Amino acid sequence: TPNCRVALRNDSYTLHKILPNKVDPLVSLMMVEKVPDSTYEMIGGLDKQI
Amino acid sequence: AVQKVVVHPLVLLSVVDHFNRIGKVGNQKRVVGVLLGSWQKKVLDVSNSFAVPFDEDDKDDSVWFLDHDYLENMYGMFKKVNARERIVGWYHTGPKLHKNDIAINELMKRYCPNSVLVIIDVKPKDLGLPTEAYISVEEVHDDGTPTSKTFEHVTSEIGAEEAEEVGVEHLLRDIKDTTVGTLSQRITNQVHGLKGLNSKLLDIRSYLEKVATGKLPINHQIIYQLQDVFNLLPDVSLQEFVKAFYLKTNDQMVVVYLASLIRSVVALHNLINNKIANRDAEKKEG
């Protein structure tokens, strides 16, 4: 599977389990998870660029 | 100027070994060996030790033999394998000590200046009685009494090391005596904490009635050492105890009064959730 992680043994180096949840370390800056911070009308004027 | 000694739980096992290393053919009924130690600053420590061939005839009780060549090699062998450990003294077992123990001590003070002896108990092990240690002191006697030795007592304790304490817990595996106790071990610590109390108090009057009769001569040393016990016990009269005892007794009854309140609400809530789940499985089974 592309970008798949496994559980690997540390002494014999054998497979233990397929891991779920594909590789994405440091997603704290990503996935902002909160939509209400500002509405739409509070810009004004520059309506062409919108 | 020895405060106390620290006996690791290894050396007494070597004594119980050497108490059985001779009992197959020996009728010596005492084990005398060489105690090795680590004198650090003021407190004494004992890590390793070994034994030495020693006999003693009951006739004339003044004849003994120590093996010096075996003492010179094997202590020298231990120095090569471990240049940390050195001599601190000797040891013997048996409660009743023979009277060559001054003659053994005054010889091997050429090895150790602060020579020390440790008495252990192999058979008297039923009550609470630890190992015992004395010290080599030389005074006259008291003031105007004839001269003697008078081995003074030094108090003793037991301390392990890090591996020497963790390796013990793996060996027992039978009761193991967990830490802070759930009201059953703590009362027994007051039960057998008091079983050794009157065993001391029966022992005081046994020596006292022995000397109130007058068979053995008196020692003034133990008299005032006993006399400050009785005129220094507290007397509970008024405003120093009977006020201040209730101030901490009516204090501690407030917090156990929460245990009356809280634990009754705990089991009541567990009663409600079962009586809901009982009648709802009952009304829907049919």
Partner: protein, 70 residues
């Protein structure tokens, strides 16, 4: 025996240990953590550790041998 198991879990944590960071959580009682020495690991967690404290890359504790979220 139940008082034995309380003391066993009690003295599994009071030891000198290393500090890593929580990375991810697989499911119930199993997570993915990486230490500060690189080399992202895969161990199990305990039930005493509250599961509503482990959303971000938070500072956690690890054993030296079992390497678990102690």
């Amino acid at each position: 025996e139940f008082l034995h198991a309380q003391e066993e879990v009690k003295r599994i944590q009071s030891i000198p240990l290393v500090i890593g960071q929580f990375l991810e959580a697989v499911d119930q009682n199993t997570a993915i953590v990486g230490s500060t020495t690189g080399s992202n690991y895969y161990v199990r967690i305990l039930s005493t550790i509250d599961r509503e404290l482990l959303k971000p890359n938070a500072s956690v504790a690890l054993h030296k041998h079992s390497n678990a979220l102690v």
